[PDB]
Scaffold this active site. Structure first.
Site: not given
Ligand SMILES: [Cu+2]
Ligand SMILES: [Cu+2]
Lengths: 620, 620
Positions: B289-290, B297-298, B373-375
């Site tokens: 839960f990004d 934003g962090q 790992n993701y962007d």
């Protein structure tokens, strides 16, 4: 040079000379369609044999002919006379469009209709539209065009703002007779102008827009060779042009290391249908087959540097035939340039301390066309990562009518008294697949949801399934956006390093397909538009989803008949036909001139490469 | 200045002081979340009250607190104790993520698992992921993190290429104990590297790319005032920033002549869930839960000119707070620029002789983030014609596993022995609607097919139908791409000149929603993801679709609870929550670093303006 090079003026003139010499192109003959044939399946036996197919119309009423000539040998390969009431009429000619207004201007029942509305006949423009096939038995075998009137108050006036509802006329453009004039009753003619160039309407022009310059100091990264052969960022292909189809792409391939790997043999928009959903007798027969009946490539605009194209543009000027077989060049009709497309790939890794970003780009091959009130932009895109995309942009002026007093379920209001009949713009992309060669198959891939239970105790598992379309009888598919349905085209004999057949996945937009009732003349004539995907076994004579002769042609030809052959498509030379379109309920923002709306599809590699094809992109 | 200006470094310092002074900022206290509250409804007493909300964690095990302070009046407006076992845990702190690898390195079970695989513990990187809420009773109240191991052969090596399957550890980050280590069996560790910067992998970089220069000799067309107030081509808005949400858009309005007309009060991506569909116990609990748990934003990046952002760019550097209340600036964390967007509108009229073309352009407001790992690239676009669009670009490196011998229905192979579990990236756009003000309503518009017969004898007619969602118990809608389903937000008390309520139509991409079984914990905790569109009555405490404390919260926390109130949404201050995401079945071309894939949605004016709002754009 290459047998995929664009037809030259010289070859057009030679086709005329050859037809003339053979007694096929006398003074009463008109070329309704002329286009170069693709090299046949079986490679080059030796030198190229440039053949051209021609549809010859006879203005004296004699039966027309379909003829194939060999400009190479200066011969006529074949020439059959056509029974148009059976197989369909030839595409409408320009000279026949200009006939509708002039003939109606002296018909007394037309004049009577205009007088009843106090309209000056000299100011009534007529939109000559294809007739289609309905209950008019006297029309079978004749070349008919229906006319709809629009008032043009002055030279620079937009007649579309002033539709004359309650009136429609049918005209035989060969015998030059007005066969019918129907007046259902008078409707006020919308009075407000739609002159988008009039400062009274536009107001003072914005002073806010600052320039954006797109330059390429060292020129573009793509090379144009042999006239129409492009090479860009590993991509290789030939940009062809047909008067009916517009830009056609041949031999789309990607240079994977030392191997030029084929992806798509031929890609084109094979048909384009614009059906109207207004049940008013004035327009219920309204259905354009812009590619089949009108020939979109014929109306291609001359793309001008700055207006239609910003950046470093490379133009191609295709040559087509006029109605007499003389060569006519479409200057700057094809626009080519490459554009920045944001981020290609990126990752800031905590553990390694490496930050990585690469820029994306796409090669754009496009052309714009104008069919009466509408303007369509056709765009083919090639991306660094192997993705192929097509995009159609619809703009122009909306086709108008009167807006009924008591409102309408099939027309929307744009201005006071001004209406806009609902309609669709449906395209058909014919993708002659060559995934690492011609041995291909198609699988329909749906997402699969799993039930929580044994083997999936936490109920979080989800899978995917693939169904191979083995025979043409089972290759007519519909969209399913809910289960994420796509279609993968693979070569069951070319495997990647992980031992899986290489492939490309087709991503459709899942827009509504043909809405008309299944039993409608349009559902039958444009049967291809009723389904999202069709797969056929390649056959050199199966070129359009609607057949060779769409004008006033009933059902009985096209996809439904090809498919009935029920051929083997599992690991064979196959062709994918994808239906995709816009369903337009005009809105106030579309008036007086509509902002671009878009539709399309794309194909992305699916286990085609052994890893990402863009690891060699420079940091730059 | 504006009550919507970005939080200042000084306001953050001030919140810190206020907390310290009230005895709320002790040695064991950490600021898990800090963000400025936006002005409440009304704002009558044009008196500023700059408030800030904070989530304070206690490292020693004491109960955490939610505190709201007023920076303008240096007060502690509120301070409540949180029963985390009841209301869920606070977002995970940066310091707790690190702690996982360290504690595991000295654990006997861990070291024993590594030894069996012959892995050198000093080379084993650990990915600290949220625990969620499953069958582990002893977890309720405790802050648990789970670690999955990846081998990093050398400093600059990409550990992602070497997942260590069959092994997973659970860690209590407060008591600092490894509560459990599970070793289901040894799996070979993928040996191939995925070092996308290594010339042995990349090969010689291509030298074919020519530069594309995008400049603005006179600067951009937008103006930034008051630090974050944007004015561009009739548009007006304030660019806010939240540590949890990222870029937030405030007061989106359009200057329609004399009136500055509001469209959207607040636009943000309120949540981001990344559920995995591999039923392996090693990963069946994995759901990021990004936004909620890790705060997007962090982890924003500093956008590098030329790399991330090309052209004439204007950057904003938001300021957040570290775990101790000190302000930390995210330099160039927000990228702003305008870009050419092809043709806006075009028509070549035969009857009038007027040839008309206009260029389109979009205003881009974006930020980029890295979550392990993701962007992800988050882009908001404003177009000349009034269209608002959002686009999410997903890149990075795929989360890996071992590809099982015999294959898998829930994992795909990227390299020899290297697997990639199937997963989704599902977003929630929270749209606090303000179409010409707050009195709004939402209708679901479906295309309607008609049967051939009386009134539609040619079976060509097709209409549309709109259903108004009156109460919240009717406002949970699903997609239907087949019937062209969209949702229109209108102001029933504001009519355009044709006397129809002004509106904006939301066009979804119709991708699949949450696939997990309905009874799964993820389905309950991320219930918003199971449907495409939600409409709720506005309430200032209903900010997130998952709730305020997603970390280890049991289920049903947000949207389902809010919707349970069944309030009146027919002509009220409402909020639209649109769920949209990518369903990822990784492919060989996603490895070693994945090329950008995208999702989004957009809203277009639906009879908002009285005619095309772009008639005043110049020809240029
Ligand atoms: Cu249209
Ligand atoms: Cu993914």
């Amino acid at each position: 040079a290459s047998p995929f090079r664009l037809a030259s003026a010289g070859e057009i003139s030679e086709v005329q000379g050859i037809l003339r010499t053979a007694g096929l192109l006398g003074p009463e003959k008109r070329i309704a369609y002329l286009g170069v044939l693709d090299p046949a399946r079986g490679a080059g036996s030796e030198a190229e044999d440039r053949r051209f197919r021609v549809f010859i119309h006879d203005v004296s009423g004699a039966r027309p002919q379909e003829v194939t000539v060999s400009v190479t040998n200066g011969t006529v390969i074949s020439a059959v006379e056509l029974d148009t009431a059976a197989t369909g009429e030839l595409p409408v000619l320009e000279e026949e469009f200009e006939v509708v207004e002039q003939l109606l201007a002296t018909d007394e029942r037309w004049l009577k209709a205009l007088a009843a509305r106090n309209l000056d006949v000299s100011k009534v423009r007529v939109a000559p539209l294809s007739a289609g096939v309905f209950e008019y038995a006297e029309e079978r075998g004749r070349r008919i065009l229906r006319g709809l009137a629009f008032v043009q108050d002055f030279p620079e006036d937009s007649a579309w703002a002033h539709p004359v509802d309650g009136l429609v006329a049918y005209v035989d453009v060969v015998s030059k007779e007005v066969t019918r004039v129907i007046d259902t009753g008078v409707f006020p003619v919308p009075a407000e102008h739609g002159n988008y160039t009039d400062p009274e309407l536009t107001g003072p022009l914005r002073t806010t827009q600052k320039p954006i310059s797109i330059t390429q100091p060292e020129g573009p990264s793509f090379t144009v060779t042999g006239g129409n052969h492009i090479e860009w960022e590993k991509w290789s292909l030939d940009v062809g042009f047909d008067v009916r189809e517009g830009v056609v792409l041949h031999n789309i391939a990607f240079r994977d290391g030392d191997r030029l790997r084929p992806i798509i043999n031929r890609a084109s928009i094979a048909e384009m249908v614009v059906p109207y959903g207004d049940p008013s007798p004035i327009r219920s027969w309204q259905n354009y087959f812009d590619t089949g009946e009108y020939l979109v490539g014929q109306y291609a605009n001359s793309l001008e540097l700055g207006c239609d194209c910003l950046g470093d543009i490379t133009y191609l000027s295709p040559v087509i035939s006029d109605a007499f077989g003389n060569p006519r060049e479409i200057r700057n009709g094809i626009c080519m340039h490459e554009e920045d497309w944001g981020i290609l790939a990126k990752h800031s890794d905590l553990w390694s301390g490496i930050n990585y970003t690469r820029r994306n780009r796409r090669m754009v091959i496009s052309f714009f066309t104008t069919i009466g009130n509408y303007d369509y932009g056709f765009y083919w895109y090639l991306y660094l990562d192997g993705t192929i995309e097509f995009e159609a942009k619809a703009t122009g002026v909306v086709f108008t009518s009167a807006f009924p007093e008591g409102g309408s379920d099939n027309i929307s209001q744009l201005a006071p008294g001004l209406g806009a009949p609902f309609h669709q713009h449906i395209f058909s992309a014919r993708l002659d697949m060559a995934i690492d060669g011609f041995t291909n198959r198609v699988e329909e891939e749906d997402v699969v949801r799993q039930t929580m239970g044994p083997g999936n105790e936490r109920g979080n598992a989800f899978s995917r399934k693939r169904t191979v379309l083995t025979r043409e009888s089972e290759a007519v598919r519909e969209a399913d956006a809910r289960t994420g349905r796509t279609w993968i085209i693979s070569n069951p004999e070319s495997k990647n390093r992980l031992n899986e057949p290489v492939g490309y996945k087709l991503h459709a937009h899942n827009q509504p397909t043909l809405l008309a009732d299944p039993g409608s003349s349009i559902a039958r004539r444009a049967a291809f538009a009723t389904k999202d995907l069709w797969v056929t076994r390649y056959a050199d004579d199966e070129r359009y989803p609607t057949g060779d002769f769409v004008n006033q042609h009933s059902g009985g030809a096209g996809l439904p008949s090809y498919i009935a052959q029920d051929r083997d498509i599992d690991g064979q030379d196959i062709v994918v036909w994808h239906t995709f379109g816009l369903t337009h309920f005009p809105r106030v923002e579309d008036w007086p001139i509509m902002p671009v709306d878009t539709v399309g599809f794309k194909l992305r590699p699916e286990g085609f490469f052994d890893r990402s094809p863009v690891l060699d992109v420079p940091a730059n």
